[PDB]
């Protein structure tokens, strides 16, 4: 009634927030998953990195999980907060 049915995508806000919460919960409490975020912490906190740091970070992330899993390159740019996500599933192997 308020939005003239333009707010229909907000009908499941509780369920989507619950699913996000569940995904965060299994994000810290899974083996071969939390150390990837720890590596992200070390990469983000330690700035002024060259390219070779980026490839060794890539294979160090790869070595944590299985050889058949999928990698995702979620690029962030401070200027413009533009998150480009790239599909490199079984590409760097």
């Amino acid at each position: 009634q308020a939005y003239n049915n333009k707010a229909f995508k907000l009908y499941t806000i509780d369920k989507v927030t619950q699913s996000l919460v569940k995904h965060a919960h299994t994000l810290m409490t899974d083996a071969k998953t939390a150390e990837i975020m720890a590596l992200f912490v070390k990469d983000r906190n330690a700035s002024t990195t060259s390219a070779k740091d980026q490839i060794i970070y890539r294979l160090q992330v790869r070595s944590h999980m299985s050889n058949t899993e999928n990698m995702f390159r979620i690029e962030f740019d401070k200027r413009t907060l533009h998150v480009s996500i790239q599909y490199i599933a079984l590409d760097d192997l």
């Binding site: 996000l20 899993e69 979620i74």
Partner: peptide, 25 residues
Amino acid sequence: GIIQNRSIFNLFANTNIYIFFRHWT
């Protein structure tokens, strides 16, 4: 080839962090 004061930051992730970030977006 040192990139000082970097602005583009890369997150490498499996399906779990990707799906979590997709739900956030």
